[PDB]
From Swiss-Prot:
TPR repeats: 26-59, 63-96, 100-133
Parent-record interval covered: 139 to 263 of 263
Encoding gene, per UniProt annotation: cpoB
Record's function text: Mediates coordination of peptidoglycan synthesis and outer membrane constriction during cell division. Promotes physical and functional coordination of the PBP1B-LpoB and Tol machines, and regulates PBP1B activity in response to Tol energy state.
Subcellular location: Periplasm
Organism: Escherichia coli (strain K12)
Annotated protein name in UniProt: Cell division coordinator CpoB
Amino acid sequence: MGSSHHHHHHSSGLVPRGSHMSGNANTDYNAAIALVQDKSRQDDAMVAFQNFIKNYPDSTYLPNANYWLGQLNYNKGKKDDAAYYFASVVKNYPKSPKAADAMFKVGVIMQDKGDTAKAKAVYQQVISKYPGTDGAKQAQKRLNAM
C-alpha cells in the first residue's frame, strides 16, 4: 500500500565505545555518498545515503549526508532536485561545510540555468559569508575565474 518506511537497520554494529569517534559518520557517509560521486554508484548512493539522511539520526552527518547528495544529485542533471537538496542541507546543517560547499556547487548550477549574473553573487557570498569553508574555498575560484 505505502508502508515502505518501517524503522529498522539503525544499528549496523560497532557502536563507538571509546573517548574518540569510532564508525565516524564522516567517513562512512563520505563513503556512502562517495557513491553518488561514483559514476557507477549514483544509485548506490541514493540507497547508501538514504540510510544516512533518513535512517541515521544517530549519525552526526544525517544532514550532510544529504549534502553530498545536494551537490552530486544536481550534477546528475537534477539541477532542480539537488538544487533544493542543498537548500535543505544548507538549512538543516548550519555548521556543515555543505552550507558553503553546495552554496558553491549548487551555487554553480545557477549559471547552468542562467544566473551567472545573479547567483554568481552566491559564490561571492560563500567566500566571505562561508569563509574558509569547503564552499568558500572552491567558490573563490568562481569569484576569480568564472
